[PDB]
């Protein structure tokens, strides 16, 4: 699902779900364990923002 | 001044007539000796500048910059040795000659007594830089980057040339001494407003100003390591020196005309540091950091107060050293992994510890950890701005916080975390690379002990 | 060897030791041990070095600059006289800076020395620095990065014109 | 704490023997809980939790569900803790 | 007097010797940590001498040994203020560092880079000494940033842990936010008082205005983890336990309180800043204690206790009782460092287990650590005639007997109750009850380093309060007469907290399950301040950066404005001029038009 | 083997010779600007015995 | 060592995971062992109550409601094993882990400090270099024409053949390298 | 039962430190010794009023001996 | 590589001046500049007015 | 689309051919001499010697001279009762106001 073409410049890039890398299951063997990302997988546009060391969107108890 | 100029000229025949094996060795030896000779200029009489001759003079502003240039040439040679090994002997000699011509032009710019000669050589510096970027860059965007750099600088400079000629016609001389001593005040007129703009805009382009800085990221990312070193260390400071020299003519109108540039720089430092927070390319991150520091220097110059000028000189020298070292550190990893993406190489501290230590010290200087000359300059600029307006402290502190954040973020991403498993080409750091990082660092830490050398004439 | 007039120090009043307990004072024995172990060898070393220096005593001299015509009497575009006056004014600026430094040094030393009575017993130094600071600010402040003797003269004239207007 | 293979086996068998539903006499290293013993799925979950609590390391559920044998638990613990003897 | 300056400077300079020798072979050998410990011990022994001299005759001094640079009318020189605060805090800090390093030798034995750890410890100690013994604001800022950077390095000691890197970055972020106010203070003093020396600043600023003091308040809040900047301290527990105990428990965190204390003569004049310090301290005490009550990690509990004690010190500053706050810092160093060492011993015994729920029945399993922790908790809760009694009881008594914001006093009393509560929590869950740790029992405290290191701080917690309180000159007019309930309020509130905590902890045994209350969730989630404050502003700043600054301005609009539009215009004109038609008939007509137009316009 | 050494490593003389030439030319330029050698209003003194120039 | 995941979680697997999470969170709430045992047997009875529901829609709705109950009743600070993700010691020794390939860049003096180990390492290198071709052939043969539809890798079919793609799993750094 | 510990090559970096330290000290130690000897024996000049009828040399306005030497030799 | 190119290179070629793009650019580009100009200009004018009125304390402000 | 040579593999590590590479070149002799030249003429010569040269650079900035002149002036003006710093930089009489 490409980003809406509103002139922002995203263009072809897909609108990947805004899930912080914390949310992805740690136990699974990732090609990049520290980033919890596999090779060839499309990379979120704001992945750097959603790294485990930065902004986190994991579900809260409250 | 010929004690420095003539050996620098003789470097060219020596490089051309040296054997293919010995080009780097001979160049490095003699450039280091030239820097040792240049160290004599640091001794400056407090009241008056060292007027060597009609054409050349030195003050406490020009001397640190000349020392920086003379020190920078051998460092550029050491850095550029590695990636130019495959090049033919003629091409390597041509590269070295471009470096030597650049050093010669820069020395003559900083020592010239006449503003028109300063302009001639300051624009002459473009040709070697452009050739370096467009011939020894490693990406297809080098041509576009060179075009951007050249055309931004020329569009800034040509009105400066017209204005300088007009000043020669009106006042009668462009010698800096005579201009300083006569220095009749300007009047608030549209003609004088446009003269002020013409004089200021060339240097405002050279010092990356927010909205005029687009050339800098392209140039620094696309250029080879040595070209990035000169661009960060001296070519930006060319603008600072020019602005400080030229501010004498435009005394009263500066108060009225500074507000656009002052606000642009004050907001742009925050914007550029925020850009540094989200950059995906290490060279680009360093380039935007340079933009932010140069914006601070622009604020200091525009404020036109003694503490501001001292901080401006200190920041110029300190930033030159820090940015050159940071580019060298990034270039080492680029040579190892052949990509500039920050995320690609991770956990290099385990693989290369001494390089990690160099990265730590470089970042600490970048975030202005005291008593680094970086912090001395930045703090003086902040105090001058506070005297200019107490509200400046909000922006200055925000910029400091973001600088710390992005510096430690670069350090954490590149040098911490789990090592990238698939990358297997990381090898023990060569003695050349560690020597280069040490030659960057040790002078910077040493200058803290005796800070009067880099505090400028107003000290 | 600093002149006492230049760097005043109030006369030292040190209370005499008046012990009232039998227990031995550790500070006294520790100071005696420090004397014997450190001060005597250091004094001997300095005696040796002072002997060596006295063996070859040579003198350095403090330069004297004769007063030169000020910018006030220098003619227009008269670059020679303007140069001399400007360098003289720069030297005077440095000397005034040093005088301010001396007064500030007195202020700091008096704050530390008086102790908890700094607010009252340092008032004279505070007044001295007040006067020196006001004079220095009036003479040199706001001149800008490119301070010149001509600009200081212009500031003085602006001030005097304001004073005449106040005189009405 | 060398944590040798025999020690891991002894501790796993110890926990299983302390399990009331398992009768100690027929408990063996190859005694499949699902087939040889009468344990159901929830009993497998409980014994996995007991093992992970005994050894203090957590077994991921995808790996946890596939044990189905005390010897499998022992060798899995050995693999996780790098026990080669 | 002559020995005073020499001894005081030697105490600092000796600490640097291991750093210099780190280049030598001793760094490679196993002897380096022992050399570092012995160096610290000798430094403490030497520092004792000037402390005795000051006790005898109050021989305070300032030493301006080196003239760094003179900037016009401002002289910057390396100056050390060897006053009461420095001459007392140096021996305390050195003693605590000695004990911590001796403990660390046991705790960090397995770590491959133990030498790097010890060197970083000495670097932190040197930076903190620079901070304490500084007569210029620039030297104090050098110490400030050095302490910050060393905390950053030591917290992220295990570079593999992403959580450690996050905690280090968070600490740097909050402390830099404090440094904003610090820089504001430095700039204001330079512009107005024309000096960065404390002496001239004190002399000129008879009635200090609000702005520099508010900046000092901000810097103090950043370093002492006050509310709004508090979360960095609990997150700092990600580092190795010796690092926590040394810096983020007893020594580094008191930097902000010490900065405020150093500026007490200016603090006296301005009433508003005193009120703000009081309110911030009360908020910190209440919030951090409430958070600690429901925490299940021993390090987190002790860290929140440290934050609450720092808030109490800030309150004491607000009540305009600076010397009492310094005394409380001195005592807190002892007992809190000891508590953290006990926690580290428990963790190491239980194979890196920090959750109190997995720890139980350790009262007899670890007798020495149990005795030490009981004594430390009693001192922390203000048990009479312990170290806490000489500080905390006087703090509360002064707070009650003074013109004070009512809610601040109430929150302070409640916070004391909660301190008793969380002491009860750690003791009850950890040492009392039945063992809950994994089967393999590896408990063994019979290590001489651990035993002796805890012994020294135990003796300190028991007797240093009395010794120091008796020896120090009287610096505050005592609250001689007060109502009996006013005198006994500290004990009454502490005992009430003990009783309520003990009953609630006993209720846990009952076989009843209730779903969590909202207040329990609020306390356990740290007031939700981490959850929202570390997400909403971080997200907004990073997203704003990328979307506006990186893209919409730099790569789009500035490029469209200056470069791209001009390039496009020149391209269009080039297409117009190079029409590529070249017909003689066409452009010869243009010659006719040009001739006619020229004749008309130019005559 | 001196001939071999000088024949392939004579380039190392150019730059030091350049420094000497620079010193000489700078001294020549100083000669050119001797107008106010001792004619100032500050450093003007009577030539001490056995002195012809103050080198200013 | 992790098994290759499946496309979906079967209903039985989801129920098992919910049971494990509920028991762990109850243990977090029930600190004392006896109370935990009591309420854990209660929870086991609760699962056994609908253990044999025949209607899959009813069982699915029960799963959904139970998950909602778990989310409301989850412990705010559940116990985490020290080495488990989110635990205190998770990834603590990661920096100490050093990949095996760093050895090949050693200076010959350092490699001479431990000759025997490097002889063994050369043997392992020879083994891997010999086995790679056969591993690739086996992977091609067993791979379906469309492509590998699961991350699972086949075992060694014949003697003298190493498991396909075995090098990194076998030579993964020790959990506690030091 | 010693287990091998994988670590990057150290000969190159340790050699780098050795060479840097050796080359720094090669001139630092002579420099340090000379500075100490000059300060101990030659010492610093004493401030004296200019004798009447004497014009001091430019290097005679500087206190430290090495500063005087540099001023006389290079400036 | 795709991520880097999309984050850096592909932005401008796939940009179109649109009312949202134009309005957001105008706001977040020039609005802050004018806001800071207003704030600082008002502050500077107030200071200059106080200085001219001789109603500002600079008793020891001798280092600017 | 063109006959072009295959991209050269990552430049051969200088460690492979000569383990004590030092970098700076392929042939070991020039490696050693380049590193010796760099280390000597930078660290030994420029850094150390020039640092001393700057450290003991003559005070042509007249800092000590300024201090001595200030001391003399302060002593004289305090002795004679004159104000320490005159408010007028230049004598009023010489100035001719409009």
UniProtKB/Swiss-Prot annotation, chain B:
InterPro entries: NADH4_N (IPR000260), NADH_Q_OxRdtase_chainM/4 (IPR010227), NADH_UbQ_OxRdtase (IPR003918), ND/Mrp_TM (IPR001750). It is an enzyme of class 7 (translocase). It is a multi-pass membrane protein. GO terms for molecular function: NADH dehydrogenase (ubiquinone) activity; ubiquinone binding. Keywords: Electron transport, Membrane, Mitochondrion, Mitochondrion inner membrane, NAD, Respiratory chain, Translocase, Transmembrane, Transmembrane helix, Transport, Ubiquinone. It is found in: Mitochondrion inner membrane. The keyword Transmembrane applies. It catalyses: a ubiquinone + NADH + 5 H(+)(in) = a ubiquinol + NAD(+) + 4 H(+)(out). The chain crosses the membrane at residues 22-42, 60-80, 98-118, 147-167, 193-213, 224-244, 257-277, 284-303, 308-330, 351-371, 391-413, 435-455. One of its GO terms (biological process) is mitochondrial respiratory chain complex I assembly. Core subunit of respiratory chain NADH dehydrogenase (Complex I) which is composed of 45 different subunits. Core subunit of the mitochondrial membrane respiratory chain NADH dehydrogenase (Complex I) which catalyzes electron transfer from NADH through the respiratory chain, using ubiquinone as an electron acceptor. Essential for the catalytic activity and assembly of complex I. Belongs to the complex I subunit 4 family. PANTHER family: NADH-UBIQUINONE OXIDOREDUCTASE CHAIN 4. This is NADH-ubiquinone oxidoreductase chain 4.
UniProtKB/Swiss-Prot annotation, chain E:
The keyword Electron transport applies. The keyword Electron transport applies. One of its GO terms (cellular component) is respiratory chain complex I. It is an enzyme of class 7 (translocase). It catalyses: a ubiquinone + NADH + 5 H(+)(in) = a ubiquinol + NAD(+) + 4 H(+)(out). Its main location: mitochondrion. Keywords: Electron transport, Membrane, Mitochondrion, Mitochondrion inner membrane, NAD, Respiratory chain, Translocase, Transmembrane, Transmembrane helix, Transport, Ubiquinone. One of its GO terms (biological process) is electron transport coupled proton transport. It is found in: Mitochondrion inner membrane. It is a multi-pass membrane protein. Its EC number is 7.1.1.2. Pfam families: NADH5_C (PF06455), Proton_antipo_M (PF00361), Proton_antipo_N (PF00662). Core subunit of the mitochondrial membrane respiratory chain NADH dehydrogenase (Complex I) which catalyzes electron transfer from NADH through the respiratory chain, using ubiquinone as an electron acceptor. Essential for the catalytic activity and assembly of complex I. Belongs to the complex I subunit 5 family. Core subunit of respiratory chain NADH dehydrogenase (Complex I) which is composed of 45 different subunits. This is NADH-ubiquinone oxidoreductase chain 5. It comes from Sus scrofa. The lineage of its organism: Eukaryota, Metazoa, Chordata, Craniata, Vertebrata.
